[PDB]
Design a protein around this ligand. Structure first.
Ligand SMILES: [Fe+3]
Ligand SMILES: [Fe+3]
Ligand SMILES: [Fe+3]
Ligand SMILES: [Fe+3]
Lengths: 172, 172, 172, 172
C-alpha cells in the first residue's frame, strides 16, 4: 500500500485508469478529425484548428487524471490507444455529430465513475469529477449540439457553402 | 435557536467544534516541529520555516471552521489544545513521517465529518468540506509522502548530509 | 489521386503513416515515464517535467508528419498506439537508458525513411526529414547519453542521493 | 573560367538560365491574372491582390537564381519572356486552376534541376533548390489546391455568391 493512500478503493483506482485511456482515445479521435479538415480536398482550416484544440484539451484531461491517480496513491496502468472508428469523417456536420457522440460517451463514463465514488464513500473523488470534468462535459455537449444545429439549419452537409461560411464565421 | 439556522444538525454542530480543536492541535504540533529545527544542535532553517508555514495554515483551517459554525448558526465551544506527542522530533525524516501521520489523522476526521454531513442531508456542509478541506489534505499528504521518499532515498536519518542537502534544495 | 500530388511514391506515403504511429508511440512512452517520476514512492519532480516535455515534443513531431502527408497529397491512416514496454521504469538512470534506446529506434526509422525517399528521388521529402527530424534526433541522443553518463558516474541507480542531486542540478 | 567557379557543371549553368526564364514567365502569368481581376466586369479586388503578390514573389524567385548563377561563376543569358496562355482567365476558379497547373509545371522543372545537380554531384546546388524552392512549391501547390476545393464546394462557377464571398473571407 502507498504511504499516501487513504479511503481510495481498488475499484476507483482501476476506474481512473480506464478513464485515462478513454481521455487519450478522445484526444486521438479529435487529432484524426483535425487533419481530415487539413486535406487539400476538404480544406476547412478552422474546423482543423477547432478539433486540434479539442485534441490538446483531451490530453490535459488525461494528464490531470494521471496526477489524481498518484495523488491518491493509486498506480497508473496504460493500455493501447485504439485508432478512431473512421479515417474519413465525411463532412464538417458529420464530424461535429461524431464529436457530440464521443463527448456523451466520455460523459457517461464520468457519471459511472461518480456513481462508483459515491458507493465507496469517496467524497474527494466525487469533488474531483464534479469540479474538473462534469461541467466541462455539459459545456462541450451544449457547444457541439449548437454547432450541429447551425450546420443543419444552414443546409449542411449538401451545402458546401454552409460549411465554408460556418468555418469562417463560427469557428474562425 | 439562531435566526440563521437552517438544515444544520446538532450532531454536525458538535462535529465542527471537534474539528476546530483538531485543526488547532495540528497548528500546535507544527509549531513544536518548527522550533525543534531552530535548535542550535539541529539547525535546519528551511525545515523550521516549512513547519512554521504549516502551523500558520492549520490556524487558518481552524478560523474558517469557526466562521462556518457562526455562518450556520452553531455555537463555538473551544477546548484545551493538547500538547504535541513529542518534545524532540529526532530528525528531518522522523518529523516529516509524524507530519504525514498527523495529516492522515486530520483527513480521517474530515472524512467522518463528511459522512455525518451526508447522513444528515447537509449539502452545504458537504460542499464546504470538499471545497476547502479534502483536496488540501490530499495535496498535503502527497507532498509529505514525496518528502519522506526523497529523504529515505538520500540516506536519512543516518546521513546528516542528506537532511542538510534536502533542507537547501527542496525546502529552500 | 490528389490534385496536389507530385513526385510522391505510394511507398513513401505508407512509410510516413508508419512514422506518425512511431512518433505517437514515443509520445506515449515519455508520458508513462513522466508520471512514474510523479509517484509518491519515486518523487523526482524534474525527471517528471523532463519526460512530459519530451512527450509533448513527440506529439508535435507526429503532427508535423500528418501536415506533411496532407501537403504531399497522401492520406493519413492512423493505427492503435501500442502501450509502453514497462509500467514501472525502475529509476532515473533506467528511464534515461530506455529513452536513449527509444530515440535511437525512432532515428533508425527516420534513416530508413530517408533511404526510401532517396531511392524514389524525392528531394522534398529528403529535405523535410533532414531539416525537421535528423538533427533533432542527434541532439536528443547526445543529451540522453550525457544524462546517462552523469547518473552512472554519480553512483546511480544505487545512490538515491545521485538521482536526487541530478534531478535538482541538471533537470532543474 | 570564372575565378570563383568550383564543382559547377556547364549543364547545371544552362539549366539555371532555363529556370530563370520559367520564373520570369510565372511572374508574367500572375501579373496577367492579377489585372484580369482588376477589370470593371470582373471586379474581385482580393483575387487581383493575391495574384499580384504571387507575381512579385516569382520575380524574387528569378532574382535569387540570377544571384546563384553569379555566385557559382556561371553567366546569365536572358531570353524573350513568353506571353501567358490567356488574356481572359474566365473566373476566380479557372484562374486558381491555371495557377495550380503553373506551380506543378515550375515544381517539375525544379525536380529535373535537382536530378541534374544530384547526377553532377553538386550538393551546394541541391541544398539551394531544397532550401529556397522545393518547399515553397509544395506550400504553393497545397494552398492553390485548398483554394480550388473551396471555390468548387461553394458552387463556383454556377453560384453567383461563391467567388464574391471567397474573395472577401479567404483572400481578404
Ligand atoms: Fe475529456
Ligand atoms: Fe488542517
Ligand atoms: Fe520524435
Ligand atoms: Fe517560382
Amino acid at each position: 500500500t502507498s504511504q499516501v493512500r487513504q479511503n481510495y478503493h481498488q475499484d476507483s483506482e482501476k476506474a481512473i485508469n480506464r478513464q485515462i485511456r478513454l481521455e487519450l482515445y478522445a484526444s486521438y479521435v479529435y487529432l484524426s478529425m483535425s487533419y481530415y479538415f487539413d486535406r487539400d480536398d476538404v480544406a476547412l482550416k478552422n474546423f482543423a484548428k477547432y478539433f486540434l484544440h479539442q485534441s490538446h484539451e483531451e490530453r490535459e484531461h488525461a494528464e490531470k487524471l494521471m496526477k489524481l491517480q498518484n495523488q491518491r496513491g493509486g498506480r497508473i496502468f496504460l493500455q493501447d490507444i485504439q485508432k478512431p472508428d473512421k479515417d474519413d469523417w465525411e463532412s464538417g456536420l458529420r464530424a461535429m455529430e461524431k464529436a457530440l457522440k464521443l463527448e456523451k460517451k466520455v460523459n457517461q463514463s464520468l457519471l459511472e465513475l461518480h456513481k462508483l465514488a459515491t458507493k465507496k464513500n469517496d467524497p474527494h473523488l466525487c469533488d474531483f469529477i464534479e469540479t474538473h470534468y462534469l461541467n466541462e462535459q455539459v459545456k462541450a455537449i451544449k457547444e457541439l449540439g449548437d454547432h450541429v444545429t447551425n450546420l443543419r439549419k444552414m443546409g449542411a452537409p449538401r451545402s458546401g457553402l454552409a460549411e465554408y461560411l460556418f468555418d469562417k464565421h463560427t469557428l474562425g
